[PDB]
Structure 1
Amino acid sequence: TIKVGINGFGRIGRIVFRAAQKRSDIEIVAINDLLDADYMAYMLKYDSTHGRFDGTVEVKDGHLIVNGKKIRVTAERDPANLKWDEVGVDVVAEATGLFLTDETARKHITAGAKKVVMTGPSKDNTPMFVKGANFDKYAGQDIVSNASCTTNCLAPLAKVINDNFGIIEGLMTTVHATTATQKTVDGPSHKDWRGGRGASQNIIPSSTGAAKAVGKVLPELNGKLTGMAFRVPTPNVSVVDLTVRLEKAATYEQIKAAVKAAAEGEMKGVLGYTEDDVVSTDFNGEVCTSVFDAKAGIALNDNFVKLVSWYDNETGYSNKVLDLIAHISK
């Protein structure tokens, strides 16, 4: 199995840790964060969004024992001190959102680590990989990025719609759930004023680089996409609203049939399809990084349409983070 050491036990670090327990190829052997071992166990035991941990966890010797296995608990501010090799960490899940550049992220490899996977879009040119889109483009790089939860939702569906009718151009909107970066009441958000406003009281316009980033994972789409976000008061689960102009004419019945196909075949597990009357909570715990909502989407005509696809911005992304870890290791 692959030895993984997570850096940052936030929303992502914790959900990837939970999802890893159900896999046979991966082993989490260490956690680093400025969290006491007993606090780390509490944050893992109870989750407001996903329920109590389906497993056992105990504190011992300053470390944790989860489901019978010992996990190294550290509190290193400087990653280049983590001595990952000592527990045998193969790939480090860089989930602090703080070291999204090769220079910073490499401090992990300097620290006895083999490879590192950013759990967020890189700030430098570090390559991002989205499952169902550009995984087969991996070139043995030791540092990569799993992109963002949104790109993980857009790229897959974009690819299918593109390869089938050609996307002339498109504008994406993501009605996204509240995240740890926001405030409970109007607070300071220097780099983004709207972002510091009361999260539960507002619909907050926000900017995302996920539409553009898709032109990076699916080069054929370079320059054909851009968009924005609206942060709304929900704790988890978001949705993309993709407005596209189609090269090849196509009826809505045809667009569905092609998404469903990719869903049942080539894209199985990454892209999903449904014709039920779903709402956001119906996707809390969703592993498919992109679920196409047939009845929600609408077409003005055969070359201009709006498509809707759901995504548990926590669960899906967290699983695909693990798939990329497996991937670059294989």
Structure 2
Amino acid sequence: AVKVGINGFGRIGRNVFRAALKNPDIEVVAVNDLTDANTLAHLLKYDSVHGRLDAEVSVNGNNLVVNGKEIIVKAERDPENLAWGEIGVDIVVESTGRFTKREDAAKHLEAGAKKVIISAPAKNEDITIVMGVNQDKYDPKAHHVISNASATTNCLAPFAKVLHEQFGIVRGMMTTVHSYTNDQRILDLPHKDLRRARAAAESIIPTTTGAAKAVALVLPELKGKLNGMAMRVPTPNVSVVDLVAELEKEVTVEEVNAALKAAAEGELKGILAYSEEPLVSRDYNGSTVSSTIDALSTMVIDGKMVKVVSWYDNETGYSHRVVDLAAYIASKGL
């Protein structure tokens, strides 16, 4: 129903497209990148991580054709020249990784779009949303440049909400053992982050992440209570959050796990999942939820310090949340 445009047809852009194919309320009519339709069509059809696309993909001129529908292909590195308005695109998914600042993301609006969903932490955005945690704060009148946060924040926020509401978080620190991404390097190349400059598939690479602090954007009561880091490892996809927190109320491992499972089957169903099986990262590839508690790893000391481990497919889960958010925003009127 709602016309959607994707800017930056990369890992998130393409997987967002795959997810959109499963939602009748969202119609992707155009994509933009820095290559030709032949290239984007080939990358969309064949995926090194998610397999062959379950749909008919071809090229007509320099446009894509998916299951009978033609998708307009653009190649403008300056978002201001996208002319979204001319093709009736109301919502733009900004997933290039280069326009997270409002001054750049807003160019889509200058170009005729109505709403912009930045697929990452942003700067000067109207509001940062994590589905299942604060989409209720979205205001169609005052919100036009929206951030869907990072995949890590979408993993953490959902269960941090449960823990705080049920037991109260005094403070905590997290570490995300994360798969490498396209922001890393193949073989020691110059990079702003001297850690990310190192061969991505050869080492455990400690790096930064504002995911823990970003939680306060969707859960203001946790402001200043969480901190964290990341460790990029030699896997192509799927990551895991490791939170150690000091709780206000005294608890047992069983109480913590019950609260999480209750939320997973209730209020956060589809967003937060709960697993009691001894699985590994590959088993979560293709998972659409934002966070899956690894219940076997939950532990507690003195009934006050707890460790919660949660899995997340940083590509598929997040992409699904982008599409969910677009439908949500659309349902509130454009």
Name the TM tier (shorter chain): over 0.9
Q: How does 1:37-48 map to 2 (within 5 A)?
A: 37-48=37-48
Shift, 1:125, TM fit: 4.5
Q: Which of 168, 175, 195 lines up with 1:173 in the alignment? A: 175
2:274 is equivalent to residue 273 of structure 1: yes
Shift, 1:328, TM fit: 1.6
2:298 is equivalent to residue 297 of structure 1: yes
Give the match for residue 138 of structure 1: 138
In structure 2, how many angstroms separate the alpha carbons of the residues matched to 1:111 and 1:40? 23
Shift, 1:96, TM fit: 0.6
- State, as a whole percentage, how many aligned pairs show the same letter: 58
1:290 partner amino acid: S
Give the match for residue 155 of structure 1: 157
Q: How does 1:14-93 map to 2 (within 5 A)?
A: 14-93=14-93
Deviations 1:225-247 (A, max 9, x none): 01001110000000000000010
2:252 is equivalent to residue 246 of structure 1: no
- Kept in 2, the 8 Å contact 1:72–1:87? The answer is no
In structure 2, how many angstroms separate the alpha carbons of the residues matched to 1:259 and 1:113? 39
Deviations 1:250-299 (A, max 9, x none): 11101111100000000000000010001111110111100001102222
Give the match for residue 222 of structure 1: 223
- Kept in 1, the 8 Å contact 2:257–2:298? The answer is no
Deviations 1:13-59 (A, max 9, x none): 01001111111100000011111011110010100000011101111
**Secondary structure of residue in 1 paired with 2:151:** coil
In structure 2, how many angstroms separate the alpha carbons of the residues matched to 1:161 and 1:49? 33
2:329 partner amino acid: I
- Kept in 2, the 8 Å contact 1:289–1:317? The answer is yes
In structure 1, how many angstroms separate the alpha carbons of the residues matched to 2:124 and 2:201? 33
- Kept in 2, the 8 Å contact 1:57–1:65? The answer is yes
Shift, 1:75, TM fit: 0.6
Shift, 1:323, TM fit: 1.0
What TM-score, normalized by structure 2, do the two folds share?
0.97
Gaps of 5+ in 2: none
In structure 2, how many angstroms separate the alpha carbons of the residues matched to 1:297 and 1:164? 16
**Secondary structure of residue in 2 paired with 1:306:** strand
Shift, 1:105, TM fit: 1.0
**Secondary structure of residue in 1 paired with 2:3:** strand
In structure 1, how many angstroms separate the alpha carbons of the residues matched to 2:282 and 2:299? 22
Shift, 1:216, TM fit: 1.4
Shift, 1:126, TM fit: 3.9
Shift, 1:200, TM fit: 1.1
- Kept in 1, the 8 Å contact 2:125–2:147? The answer is no
In structure 2, how many angstroms separate the alpha carbons of the residues matched to 1:80 and 1:183? 29
In structure 2, how many angstroms separate the alpha carbons of the residues matched to 1:126 and 1:302? 39
2:166 is equivalent to residue 164 of structure 1: yes
Give the match for residue 204 of structure 2: 203
- Kept in 2, the 8 Å contact 1:273–1:293? The answer is yes
Gaps of 5+ in 1: none
Deviations 1:61-88 (A, max 9, x none): 2111111101010111211111112221
2:34 partner amino acid: L
- Kept in 1, the 8 Å contact 2:126–2:144? The answer is no
- Kept in 1, the 8 Å contact 2:272–2:289? The answer is yes
**Secondary structure of residue in 2 paired with 1:194:** coil
- Kept in 1, the 8 Å contact 2:125–2:146? The answer is no
What TM-score, normalized by structure 1, do the two folds share?
0.98
In structure 1, how many angstroms separate the alpha carbons of the residues matched to 2:28 and 2:209? 31
In structure 1, how many angstroms separate the alpha carbons of the residues matched to 2:267 and 2:307? 23
In structure 2, how many angstroms separate the alpha carbons of the residues matched to 1:72 and 1:283? 33
- C-alpha RMSD of the superposition: 0.9
| Moved segments of 4+, more than 3 Å | none
Shift, 1:101, TM fit: 1.8
